[PDB]
């Protein structure tokens, strides 16, 4: 177009999201196994 | 509608809110003059949009 001319609901939903990926991390080292 | 930045990619992805890639250069409505789409990077909507 142009361009120049030069917190209780987010903390609680990143754990939950580090922990649903620890989840997926720990069901797919099993699998190689 | 979608785009891809990196070299490999799967599906192509989609431009994301307050974004739009036209489908050619030439065919456009809101361009500024100075740069054209060539696929890979998303432009941004221009005000009033």
């Given at each position: 177009?142009?361009?120049?001319?030069?917190?209780?609901?987010?903390?609680?939903?990143?754990?939950?999201?580090?922990?649903?990926?620890?989840?997926?991390?720990?069901?797919?080292?099993?699998?190689?196994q | 509608?979608?785009?891809?930045?990196?070299?490999?990619?799967?599906?192509?992805?989609?431009?994301?809110?307050?974004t739009?890639?036209?489908?050619?250069?030439?065919?456009?409505?809101?361009?500024?003059?100075?740069?054209?789409?060539?696929?890979?990077?998303?432009?941004?909507?221009?005000t009033?949009?």
């Amino acid at each position: 177009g142009g361009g120049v001319n030069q917190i209780l609901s987010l903390m609680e939903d990143e754990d939950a999201e580090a922990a649903q990926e620890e989840q997926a991390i720990v069901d797919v080292d099993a699998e190689m196994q | 509608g979608y785009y891809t930045d990196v070299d490999g990619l799967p599906i192509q992805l989609p431009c994301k809110p307050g974004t739009f890639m036209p489908f050619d250069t030439a065919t456009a409505n809101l361009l500024d003059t100075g740069l054209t789409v060539d696929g890979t990077q998303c432009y941004t909507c221009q005000t009033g949009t």
